[PDB]
């Protein structure tokens, strides 16, 4: 009943390693999962619904992980604080590169995928702006740009930059350099007077 | 002979305002251009080839404009220097939002579009890193991150952020705030010790 769904999901992720969604069929997924094609159709209406679910799981896993840090006041400098937070996304999405690649491409063809991404991007930006605001309150960061606007561009940077790196796009920041790169830009733009 | 091509190009850009490429037909474009369908096929092999050409023109227009500034040593502060350069892209792409939207989406389905974008992104990053290097040489900017890595992430920020704004994505930085936002992050990350 339920392993069947989980077997579909694993097969989908497995097969996403080697080819896009357009090159994987319901037969491909039923076959991998040890089920017939109409039995697939009991768990999912389409291969696109399988992707949506994979992406949902990865996005939520990154969100929950971020909330774990949000509840814990880890004794450290400002720089370490942002690094560990950026690291949540580096590690989560980086541990699921195929789903991330596929999920990003699916934004353009699927309003459910587009909505999903939009929802969590809104949450992550709001939390970032909440933290920049706290920093400003305590006199740790200067009152420069509107915090929500600053938080938007920085999170958009992280999206584009982390994902370009994972896919090895030309141009991209090498995966082994991306964390350091993003953290530099975050700290100097949040804390910098100029 | 040649206005016919230019009429196809104008009709394509006109029609891109109201719907995507998938909702515009060769008949749509021949019709707008005052030509028959087989006469279209003399100038372009596909609607996708019409897009590629539109994008090529917009990318080159932004590149030439950037090179005009690159040759001129405009007397001003560091902040103004980057602002006018970022402005080249804000203005060019912002004056051609439909082609930009369509051209960005076409990256995913067209290796010629993907290659085109990749080529110019490589050029623009190289020039940015060349300027950061000059700044460092003259003692204007500190030797923090590798310049080419810094330049990559900043240009990726500009890509994602400017384009999200133009399309009015949720989340996005309002178009009237995006220039100020990007310039802040560029100046603090290039010039900031921390
Ligand atoms: C200070 C704490 C740990 C609370 O927050 C952070 O350090 N953050 C908040 C969220 C930031 C974030 N990055 C991202 C994305 C990366 C890639 C695509 S979205 N989404 O949110 C990373 C830094
Ligand atoms: C200092 C000079 C004027 C030489 O350069 C700049 O100010 N630049 C270099 C190029 C930078 C750039 N932005 C972009 C993109 C914006 C949107 C998509 S690419 N490409 O290159 C903008 C700032």
UniProtKB/Swiss-Prot annotation, chains A, B:
Record's keyword annotation contains Repressor: yes
The UniProt keywords, alphabetically, are: DNA-binding, Repressor, Transcription, Transcription regulation
Pfam families per the UniProt record, alphabetical:
EthR_C, TetR_N
Known DNA-binding region: 25-44
A single MF term (Gene Ontology): transcription cis-regulatory region binding
Q: What start-end ranges are recorded for coiled-coil regions in this protein?
A: none
Residue span(s) of domain HTH tetR-type: 2-62
SUPFAM superfamilies recorded: Homeodomain-like (SSF46689), Tetracyclin repressor-like, C-terminal domain (SSF48498)
Q: Does the keyword Membrane apply?
A: no
Its biological purpose is as follows: Involved in the repression of the monooxygenase EthA which is responsible of the formation of the active metabolite of ethionamide (ETH).
What assembly does the database describe for this protein? Answer: Homodimer.
Name the chain's protein: HTH-type transcriptional regulator EthR
Q: Which organism is it from?
A: Mycobacterium tuberculosis (strain CDC 1551 / Oshkosh)
